[PDB]
């Protein structure tokens, strides 16, 4: 038995179209902008820049360790060892995917502190740009507004070159000095 | 309140400190000399560089 979603659509006999997934912002049916949470409320897609993601997972495993000990009653290279220890505590251990993920995240995160990831998240989610771009803008370090618009091609006409270049400056300024 | 710059009771141990130095009203020529002398102290501090080589 495998996992299901909040997307209920009834594909009766009519198999296909399964139209390709590209950054023409045409992601899956599953990674659509209009999502639905377990409380039925229509809620927007949640995309994470690897740092926003690093923090989320760390937070979740930290809180899990709490309940695991409760139910039992009756510097980056330094973060890697610290995280690899938390994984030994909460995770199934067979889950090697999370181990690599956490290592990659620790080594590639642009913003260390939660405070930092807070401003990143503000500055960006005010552009009206779709969660995918807003994440790739947070996770890909670009200098020219062309570097950005080339790598994130979906952006193309969505933002001024200057407006994007102004953002790229105040993004570089937020980067935690590793 | 919100537009005001001052110092608190603070400025006072700032005086305790200023008066704790060896100076105050004797002017420019004798003062320039003290500067060269403090610089000589920093140069005698380089001596720390020499001794650090020894720690080796």
């Amino acid at each position: 038995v495998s996992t299901s979603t909040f997307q209920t659509r009834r594909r009766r006999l009519k198999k296909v179209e399964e139209e390709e997934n590209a950054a023409t912002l045409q992601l899956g049916q599953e990674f659509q902008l209009k999502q639905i949470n377990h409380q039925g409320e229509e809620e927007e897609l949640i995309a994470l820049n690897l740092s926003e993601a690093r923090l989320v997972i760390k937070e979740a495993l930290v809180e899990r360790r709490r309940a695991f000990k409760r139910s039992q009653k009756k510097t980056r290279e330094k973060e890697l060892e610290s995280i690899d220890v938390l994984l030994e505590q909460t995770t199934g251990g067979n889950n090697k995917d999370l181990k690599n993920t956490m290592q990659y995240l620790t080594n590639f995160s642009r913003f260390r502190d939660q405070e930092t990831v807070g401003a990143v998240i503000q500055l960006l989610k005010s552009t009206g740009l779709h969660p995918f771009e807003v994440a790739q803008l947070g996770s890909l370090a670009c200098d020219t507004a062309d570097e950005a618009k080339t790598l994130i091609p979906s952006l193309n006409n969505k933002i001024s070159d200057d407006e994007l270049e102004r953002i790229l400056k105040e993004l570089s300024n937020l980067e935690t000095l590793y | 309140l919100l537009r005001k710059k001052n110092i608190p009771e603070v400025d006072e141990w700032m005086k305790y400190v200023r008066e704790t130095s060896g100076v105050t009203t004797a002017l420019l020529k004798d003062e320039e000399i003290e500067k060269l002398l403090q610089q000589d102290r920093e140069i005698t501090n380089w001596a720390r560089t020499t001794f650090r080589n020894e720690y080796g």
């Binding site: 405070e115 401003a119 | 309140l1 608190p8």
Partner: peptide
């Protein structure tokens, strides 16, 4: 996103920042 909200404390009862000497005409 530094923390969440911003910590009030606003104060006019503090030590004091103003002196006084031009009161005389």
């Amino acid at each position: 996103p530094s923390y969440s909200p911003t910590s009030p404390s606003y104060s006019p009862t503090s030590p004091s920042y103003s002196p006084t000497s031009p009161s005389y005409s």
